[PDB]
Amino acid sequence: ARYGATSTNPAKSASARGSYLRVSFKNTRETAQAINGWELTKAQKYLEQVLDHQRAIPFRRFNSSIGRTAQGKEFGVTKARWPAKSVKFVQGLLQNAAANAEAKGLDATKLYVSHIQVNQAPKQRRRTYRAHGRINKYESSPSHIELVVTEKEEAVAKAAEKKVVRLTSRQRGRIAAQKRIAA
Template identity: 70%
Template sequence: MVRYAATEIEPAKSARARGAYLRVSFKNTRETAQAINGWKLQRAVTFLENVKEHKEAVPMRRYAGSTGRTAQGKQFGVSKARWPIKSAEFLLGLLKNAEANADAKGLDTGALIVKHIQVNQAPKQRRRTYRAHGRINLHTCQTPATSSSSSPRLRRLSRSPRRLLAVRTSA
């Protein structure tokens, strides 16, 4: 059985996909995943395809050391951005897998939202290949993703800390 970090998401209204021991840069994949977290699934797929064609850039926020500046980062409010093509390809495959899983469950794929996406470092390889000029082969990463159909938002009725009431409202 596979464990996921997000356990509170309803399994009947969500579809999951997971990638393990991916031969792709952890830092670039983490930044790409954080860029699409919370987006509609169709928009995330379009964004990743645009990243592969250098039409949109992925903002580099945490792992931004020695990253060049580009004007395409303006839409995210940053100046440092990149086009991690390999990470975009892996995440695109992951989202298409989640979309196929949602279709198999009978969910509306047009209303899916990327509710939770997380990138973890995979265990280091035992034997690393040291290359010329101090290079070492890339470390792998593991990526679980959850796409969920849009659910109604909860609105607070009472601000009292003892009594919290919630009512479903349309989004």
Template identity: 60%
Template structure:
């Protein structure tokens, strides 16, 4: 089995052979809006269940980094659960899924532990790049299926069945949140009218002109 390798894929092209001068393309699902304000840790051929890791990634998308770290640590201790929305066949129900608006949830400790380590690695990379760690949030995270790893299991009457594993690729983009500036109050407030109110005002205007 190939062990997962944690890489930082900021260079979009990496030299494959200096003698031939060829290049090996490093595929990323999304390029950050700003390289100076983002960090992209990734992992290839991760020997973790694709379906479980995908649900973990979906649960933390858009969260602030500090909140995501706390959430995944709670999942490992079964204090909070990961809602299963897509790959939910045969998944049991639990009361911890109620805050997410679903009934099915689990505690995929192995996937949560790895994603937690990946986020901590990204946090360290962000500190090296001089980013404000307190303002980082998970702007993009994607989990893709990797080539299945093949084993075999021996059955009765001399048969052999495949015994496959489902590894995955994972990629995260951490970005600094934009600072929001409150609009200055100039005393001119524009009233927002719905369609019915606009029609009523138009009808009153026609009656007044008549």
């Protein structure tokens, strides 16, 4: 409950969330942004292809000193990877949201990922043993994922504000003179 910021109709929307999931925050963020705004079946097909290494997930932000591949050309980048675990969590949540939409009674074919956000969860901390008798941290950086799918509506509306206009007497007289000499 109390999802992130949305601009959508909750009646034409369905939601899913997964908290305290032991999966890399940095990889899940990229995996989510790879399907933000996407049609749902297209996204599911894409993620299956990512698992089968036929397509890739573009890494935009958490990408330092990672490798390159040809499967980034699809997105205008060179740095792309195939985060299996994040993909599987994300498509589980997509399954959940699609089932919730079917229960709400939605079209099931006009659905698109209108919202998907990943934020950090509390660290799960273990120890690393280093040289010279030292102890460092070894933390998992888990993820909360929330996503909202929405039905696509046609063009929204028109008929903007009244657009009141204030004229000086000089401008009114100019308009009157032009309307007099012309038609």
